[PDB]
Design a protein around this ligand. Structure first.
Ligand code: NI
Length: 341
């Protein structure tokens, strides 16, 4: 059954609630973004209204075959009325098409649901600046001070400089990037751009990227693996065995692989700066784990919530253990005492 933190009180609405069958009393289902833990359950057989961004709606239609008559895309930054209730979609700074949802309840209560997000000061000058928020349904993925990582721009600078140096030293090196979902496209796009290549990938991944409104994509991506020296592979193949096997398939065009595995946070963040990151190497294969996150660091999260000053916080991540819930609640009270709300 649908958990309480997916239900918006005072409405008929749910958020990211497709894996529970028909939800009792739900008249409209919102989807914040196209990640499988959130869309799980959607198909051609779904016959209730789904509200989402334009990009998420293109993905629903083409990848899951949801019928067009049930897809209700909404423009961003625009007040819309859904089943009698004013809503706004805002950019979440997560993966392509990902949104936060502002609900203006009939009784005067204002609710923000972040979906998954990477908090940023730029959000302090969106339509959030203009009213009070009573309830915040918060992506608490990295809600503890140990979770530190660099800016996405510093991680991309490292990746571009590493790839450009390796291929300039050896024009016969191949670059490989791992993926398993949408998001983190800057990693493979910025490396291809510095090297003067397109990114080569499977037909299924190409189809997924063509759903995304990224300008000049016919320009950066391809299914012709032979024409490309940046290849995208499933994340499970980014290991010495899978990479050795890929290099055989390339028919003697290449004699070295440099690979990237974008992860979120890992514990080597506690000890090493991005500048000082080194690979794992076996023979002519080197693998870099790079901390490219599409979720808030602790500090970014704390800044956003201290600016917003909500009256009540509802965590949507790490809710399954008493120790996780108690730790998160202790941090929310510190933040509130420090900032004075
Ligand atoms: Ni996500």
């Amino acid at each position: 059954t649908c958990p309480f933190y997916k239900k918006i009180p005072g409405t008929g609405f749910t958020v990211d609630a497709f894996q529970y069958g028909v939800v009792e009393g739900c008249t409209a289902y919102f989807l914040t973004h196209f990640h499988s833990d959130h869309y799980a359950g959607l198909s051609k057989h779904f016959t209730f209204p789904v509200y989402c961004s334009e990009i998420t709606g293109n993905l629903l239609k083409n990848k899951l075959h949801v019928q067009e008559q049930y897809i209700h895309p909404l423009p961003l930054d625009t007040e819309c009325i859904v089943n009698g209730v004013k809503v706004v979609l805002l950019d979440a700074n997560h993966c392509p098409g990902a949104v936060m949802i502002l609900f203006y309840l009939p009784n005067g209560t204002v609710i923000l649901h972040t979906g998954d997000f990477r908090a940023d000061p730029s959000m302090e000058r969106s339509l959030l600046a203009d009213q009070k928020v009573h309830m915040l349904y918060l992506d608490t993925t990295y809600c503890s001070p140990e979770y530190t990582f660099p800016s996405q721009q510093e991680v991309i600078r490292f990746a571009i400089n590493t790839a450009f140096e390796a291929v300039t030293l050896n024009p016969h090196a191949l670059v490989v990037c791992g993926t398993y979902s949408i998001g983190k496209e800057k990693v493979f796009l910025a490396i291809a751009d510095v090297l003067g290549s397109k990114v080569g990938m499977s037909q299924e991944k190409y189809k997924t990227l063509q759903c995304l409104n990224i300008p000049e994509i016919n320009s950066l991506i391809t299914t012709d693996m032979c024409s490309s020296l940046v290849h995208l592979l499933p994340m499970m193949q980014i290991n010495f065995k899978g990479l050795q096997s890929h290099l055989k398939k390339c028919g003697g065009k290449y004699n070295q692989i440099l690979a990237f595995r974008p992860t979120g946070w890992t514990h080597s963040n506690k000890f090493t700066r991005i500048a000082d990151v080194i690979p794992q190497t076996k023979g002519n294969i080197s693998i870099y784990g790079i901390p490219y996150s599409e979720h808030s660091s602790y500090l970014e999260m704390k800044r956003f919530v201290q600016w917003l000053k909500p009256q009540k916080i509802i965590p949507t991540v790490n809710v399954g253990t008493w120790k996780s819930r108690s730790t998160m609640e202790k941090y929310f009270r510190e933040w509130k005492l420090e900032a004075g709300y």
